[PDB]
Design a protein around this ligand. Structure first.
Ligand SMILES: O=C(CNc1cc(F)cc(F)c1)N[C@@H](C(=O)NO)c1ccc(-c2cc(F)c(F)c(F)c2)cc1
Ligand SMILES: [Mg+2]
Ligand SMILES: [Mg+2]
Ligand SMILES: [Mg+2]
Ligand SMILES: [Mg+2]
Ligand SMILES: [Zn+2]
Length: 889
């Protein structure tokens, strides 16, 4: 397998100036004719002309309208088309080809493929070569002139990039459309869509040039009523880029298209963004609440690529985080402003510190700009995206809004229309940094280590207060564990947003302050500090690090109650929980290991429980925040702090802690569940798809979290509430009634009720599948067998497969059954899926990522299944490369 190295980047010996495509869709095949107007670059040294071309059936290839002859003038091996240099012209020439491809049987969903009755392309990263021959790398920019033809009845709507410049009828019930896109673009942003699409549309007038932009959102006819929120989100995205960044859309039209079969969430093809239907379509009657934030973030994300990815492009794939991390950061700024809820930022931190921290301490650990890759499909990772976003956000923390905006505009103005690298962005931020510090000697050279150094830094603290001197000191240390990428880890530039809370009145003691830690350790001293403060550290989660605050639980409770920063309050709660979890875990472990007939458990801190009650009973406190404080930290967060983690002992630990708190607060929980109903389930705007209230959605989250806690606790007659909840019009509510009914004899009655509510909407049925998959059922293995036989069957839809299996893999007690039956089951699903969709098979490997963190018996069970998958003769390149790296082989 070819390893590509970042240091090996070299420009092509060739240039592709113009692409002229004819894509003729027929019943059993698609014919692709392509003329490439090419040239010889200054880097050419007489080499063979090598095109990428994967799975193409050649009808003919030509140079300057002279048919080429196979074996003597070119070789094709189903991966590379090699034209021997003797037959390669030395000046401007035309290469042309006609190939046959087969979208109908393209179940890997890369290149050109059929999703239900829609023909659709997915070309990022290296999928364009599955459509026609190309030098398939993002530094080959070309103009595109694309004609698509098809049966008019099956495919009345034809779309590609650029302006539709012709529409014409063809004998035999066919028709064509020609799309010309003069501005240069890389081939991974090419797209084509053909189908019986229905749409909503609007006109957006840009803020400064007053250009009219036509906005279209498309789906299959059955789901056209689910398009309205997406259109509203697109308008919102457009306005936010104008308002925050001063950036306007440059083209006359923007199309968004939903398809049912998609490997990921969505794709930013220029003027033609293509979406997983679950990330574009929603209605209040047929979607859970999560869909609304999902559509907002995904529509926003693809729109923000128009600058950060499409107008400023990548030189090579090693710069992926420069468009993905930066666009996630732009998307997070947008979402935070649109939702105006503190849980938006908390939810991104929660994902980073569980999923991405796990990845960064796994054998898969890599920096946000890796040094090498084998599979580009495996290159797309939470490290590149989400740690990338936190690295791009730290620039804003360091610079402040005004100078961040100045540096960002320097980046856009200097690189608009050109490729760029991570260094280019750092240079633009450095210029703003010089301006801010009024110091042209200031620099961000150290900041570049965030792109090259893998692993999560640990930041720890000690404090000193001299009452007589009124002098306060914060001593800070940073440390990154050595790994396979660096034997010696260098200190990073770590910005530490800090407040100092007066413990007597809860007030701020200093102005906003960002400590710039640039050494392995430093001491930050504050004078005129009138009383000993409680420090509020890493406000907003200001760096992607393990925070060791070294505070007592009494101090953390005070921050939880009285601090001004939502993250520090939530993190103080998290830290209290974590101390309790580790202590009880060790006590349960010892009792198991020593076969104790009796033992003691350390109870949950009573003042902590009192503080939870105090916040829950505060009517001015935020419902979303409340839902976070009654939930223990995620299992994948906990696992970063325990070696040889016994999942059974952890399940017993969580059970004890939840029972402790519930035994004190269940009556509070129940009272709030009842009092929240009126506002949480208000139907005033149920038939207004444009009216989305994130606060109300957070109140439903709180109710459904409380209902879960009360159901698990078998709170007296709570089943009455569950049954009434099942009649709510909101799917978040009636799907909640299914999963919380798992603890009752009514489960299968609600199983059937919610199935009939769900089965006639493709996306709702998938949410139903997830709810069943996630259900806390002792018979979950028989239930999964039932889903397989009755609902899932042989579906190759990734949404179907992921819905049935991934939630179950988070069932701590049952997926990790000591027999290994859960590992066996998911390995069978991975191997089966790998026959037709390697990239989704690799997604289904996610539960194995922590394999070497578990107890030794479960490590061996997991390792056995991965070795079994690795031994399959037909294993894909994706799956082999991933499991080889994951198993340290
Ligand atoms: O949708 C999402 C959710 N984020 C995400 C985060 C991860 F860490 C991993 C992941 F998979 C997704 N991201 C978008 C995005 O960034 N849109 O702008 C995206 C992601 C991957 C491809 C792609 C790459 C290939 F090599 C392919 F072969 C292929 F079919 C698709 C296309 C678009
Ligand atoms: Mg083929
Ligand atoms: Mg405006
Ligand atoms: Mg289907
Ligand atoms: Mg290794
Ligand atoms: Zn993206």
């Amino acid at each position: 397998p070819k390893i590509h190295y970042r240091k090996d980047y070299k420009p092509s010996g060739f240039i592709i100036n113009q692409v002229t495509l004819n894509i003729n869709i027929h019943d059993q095949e698609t014919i692709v004719r392509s003329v490439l107007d090419m040239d010889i670059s200054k880097h050419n040294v007489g080499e063979d002309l090598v095109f990428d071309g994967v799975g193409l059936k050649i009808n003919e290839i030509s140079i300057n309208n002279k048919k080429l002859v196979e074996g003597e003038e070119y070789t094709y091996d189903n991966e590379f088309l090699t034209i021997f240099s003797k037959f390669v012209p030395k000046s401007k020439f035309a290469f042309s080809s006609e190939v046959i491809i087969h979208p109908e049987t393209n179940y890997a969903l890369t290149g050109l493929y059929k999703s239900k009755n829609i023909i659709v392309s997915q070309c990022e990263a290296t999928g364009f070569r599955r459509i026609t021959f190309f030098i398939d790398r993002p530094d080959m920019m070309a103009k595109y002139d694309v004609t698509v033809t098809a049966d008019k009845e099956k495919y009345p709507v034809l779309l590609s990039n650029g302006d539709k410049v012709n529409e014409f009828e063809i004998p035999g019930g066919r028709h064509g459309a020609r799309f010309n896109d003069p501005p240069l673009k890389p081939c991974y942003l090419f797209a084509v869509v053909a189908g019986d699409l229905k749409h909503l549309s609007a006109t957006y007038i840009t803020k400064y040039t007053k250009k009219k932009v036509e906005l279209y959102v498309f789906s299959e006819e059955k789901y056209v009523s689910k398009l309205q929120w997406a259109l509203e989100c697109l308008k919102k995205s457009m306005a936010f880029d104008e308002d925050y960044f001063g950036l306007e859309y440059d083209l006359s039209r923007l199309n968004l298209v939903a398809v049912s079969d998609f490997n990921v969430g969505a794709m930013e093809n220029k003027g033609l963004n293509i979406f997983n239907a679950n990330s574009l379509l929603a209605s209040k009657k047929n979607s859970i609440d999560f869909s609304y934030a999902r559509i907002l973030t995904v529509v926003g994300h693809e729109y923000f690529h128009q600058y950060t990815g499409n107008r400023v492009t990548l030189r090579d794939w090693f710069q992926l985080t420069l468009k993905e991390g930066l666009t996630v950061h732009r998307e997070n700024l947008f979402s935070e402003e649109m939702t105006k809820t503190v849980t938006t930022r908390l939810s991104h931190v929660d994902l980073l510190r569980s999923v991405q921290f796990l990845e960064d301490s796994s054998p898969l650990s890599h920096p946000i700009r890796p040094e090498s890759y084998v599979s580009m499909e495996n290159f797309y990772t939470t490290t590149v995206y989400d740690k990338g976003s936190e690295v791009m956000r730290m620039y804003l923390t360091i610079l402040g809004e005004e100078y961040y905006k100045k540096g960002f505009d320097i980046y856009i103005k200097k690189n608009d229309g050109n490729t760029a690298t991570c260094e280019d962005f750092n240079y633009a931020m450095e210029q703003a940094y010089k301006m801010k510090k009024a110091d042209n000697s200031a620099n961000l050279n150290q900041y570049l280590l965030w792109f090259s150094q893998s692993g999560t830094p640990h930041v720890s603290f000690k404090y000193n207060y001299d009452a007589e001197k009124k002098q306060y000191s914060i001593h800070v240390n940073q440390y990154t564990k050595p790994d396979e990428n660096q034997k010696e880890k260098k200190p990073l530039f770590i910005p530490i947003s800090v407040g100092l809370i007066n413990p007597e009145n809860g007030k701020e003691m200093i102005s906003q302050t960002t400590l710039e830690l640039t050494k392995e350790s430093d001491t930050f001293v504050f004078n005129n500090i009138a009383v000993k403060p409680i420090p509020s550290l890493f406000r907003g989660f200001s760096a992607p690090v393990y925070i060791e605050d070294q505070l007592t639980d009494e101090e953390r409770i005070l921050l939880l109650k009285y601090d001004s920063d939502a993250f520090v309050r939530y993190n103080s709660c998290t830290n209290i929980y974590m101390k309790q979890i580790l202590m009880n875990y060790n006590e349960f472990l010892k009792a198991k290991n020593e076969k104790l007939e009796s033992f003691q458990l350390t109870p949950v801190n009573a003042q902590f429980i009192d503080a939870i009650k105090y916040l829950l009973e505060d009517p001015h406190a935020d419902a979303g925040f409340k839902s976070y404080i009654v939930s223990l930290p995620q299992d994948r967060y906990i696992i970063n702090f325990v070696s040889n983690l016994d999942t059974d002992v952890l399940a017993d630990t969580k059970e004890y802690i939840y029972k402790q708190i519930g035994d004190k607060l269940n009556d509070v929980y129940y009272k709030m569940f009842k009092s929240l109903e009126a506002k949480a389930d208000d139907l005033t705007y149920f038939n207004d798809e444009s009216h989305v209230d994130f606060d109300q959605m957070n109140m439903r989250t709180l109710r459904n979290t409380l209902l879960s806690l009360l159901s698990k606790a078998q709170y007296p007659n709570i089943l009455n509430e569950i049954i009434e909840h099942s009649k709510s019009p909101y799917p978040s509510n009636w799907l909640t009634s299914l999963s919380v009914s798992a603890y009752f004899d009514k489960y299968f009655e609600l199983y059937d009720k919610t199935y009939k509510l769900s089965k006639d909407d493709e996306l709702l049925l998938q949410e139903w599948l997830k709810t069943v998959s996630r259900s806390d059922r002792k018979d979950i293995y028989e239930i999964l067998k039932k889903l397989e036989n009755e609902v899932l069957k042989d579906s190759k839809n990734p949404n179907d497969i992921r819905a049935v299996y991934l939630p179950f893999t988070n069932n701590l007690r049952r997926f990790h059954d000591i027999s290994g039956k859960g590992y066996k089951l998911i390995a069978e699903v991975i191997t089966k899926t790998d026959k037709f969709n390697p990239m989704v098979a690799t997604q289904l490997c996610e539960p194995f990522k922590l394999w070497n963190k578990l107890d030794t018996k479960r490590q061996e069970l997991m390792l056995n299944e991965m070795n079994t998958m690795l031994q399959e003769p037909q294993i894909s390149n994706n799956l082999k490369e991933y499991l080889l790296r994951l198993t340290n082989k």
